[PDB]
């Protein structure tokens, strides 16, 4: 899960990963802001790990200790499909719905989000036309 894909994980109620997978926000030196990751990663890994991942492109492997800051279950490719089906049945009731609503309200307030997206709107625009990014993007083949 890289970039936009890795950003997506900071939003899920449950996250499974294959033992050989990794997660990263790679463009530490000449990329655009990694979506809402800058607003959410801290909540998941703390200030230090957030800056290692986003400021210095640190890549995190599924099987290392800190992967549990982002992934709930790391399973062998052979037993992966079964684990997914199993996790899908544990989130059915109304308790889950009520609780995740209260949890999300606490983790990310309406103001926290609106405020962030506001600045992001202009910051991400300027980066979208940054010579360094335009430059880096042209070399991808």
Ligand X SMILES: CC(C)(COP(=O)(O)OP(=O)(O)OC[C@H]1O[C@@H](n2cnc3c(N)ncnc32)[C@H](O)[C@@H]1OP(=O)(O)O)[C@@H](O)C(=O)NCCC(=O)NCCNC(=O)Cc1cc(O)cc(O)c1
Cα-to-chain-centroid distance, residue 101: 19
* Partner in contact with 128, chosen from a second copy, ligand X, none, beta carbon below 5 to 8 Å by kind: none
Q: Which is nearer to ligand X, 44 or 120 (CB)?
A: 120
74 bridge partner residues: 17
Give every CB contact of residue 103 below 8 A, 6+ residues apart in sequence.
Answer: none
Q: Hey, which residues between 74 and 113 contact ligand X (CB under 6 A)?
A: none
Q: Is 75 in the site for a second copy (CB under 8 A)?
A: no
A 10 A CB-CB count for 94 gives: 7
DSSP annotation of 69 reads: G
Q: Is 47 annotated as a binding residue?
A: no
- How far apart are CB 5 and ligand X at their closest, in Å? 7
**Given the rule CB under 6 A, which residues bind ligand X?**
2-4, 26-27, 31-35
């Amino acid at each position: 899960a890289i970039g936009g894909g890795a950003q997506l994980l900071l939003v899920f109620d449950r996250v499974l990963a294959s033992s050989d997978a990794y997660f990263s926000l790679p463009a530490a030196k000449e990329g655009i802001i990694p979506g809402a990751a800058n607003l959410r990663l801290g909540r998941f890994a703390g200030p230090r790990v957030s800056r290692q991942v986003i400021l210095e492109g640190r890549r995190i492997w599924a099987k290392e200790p800190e992967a549990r800051l982002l992934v709930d279950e790391v399973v062998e490719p052979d037993e992966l499909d079964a684990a997914i089906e199993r996790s899908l049945t544990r989130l059915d009731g109304d308790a889950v719905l009520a609780n995740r609503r209260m949890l999300n309200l606490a983790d990310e307030s309406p103001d926290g989000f609106r405020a962030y997206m506001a600045e992001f709107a202009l910051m991400q625009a300027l980066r979208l036309y940054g010579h360094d990014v335009i430059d880096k993007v042209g070399r991808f083949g």
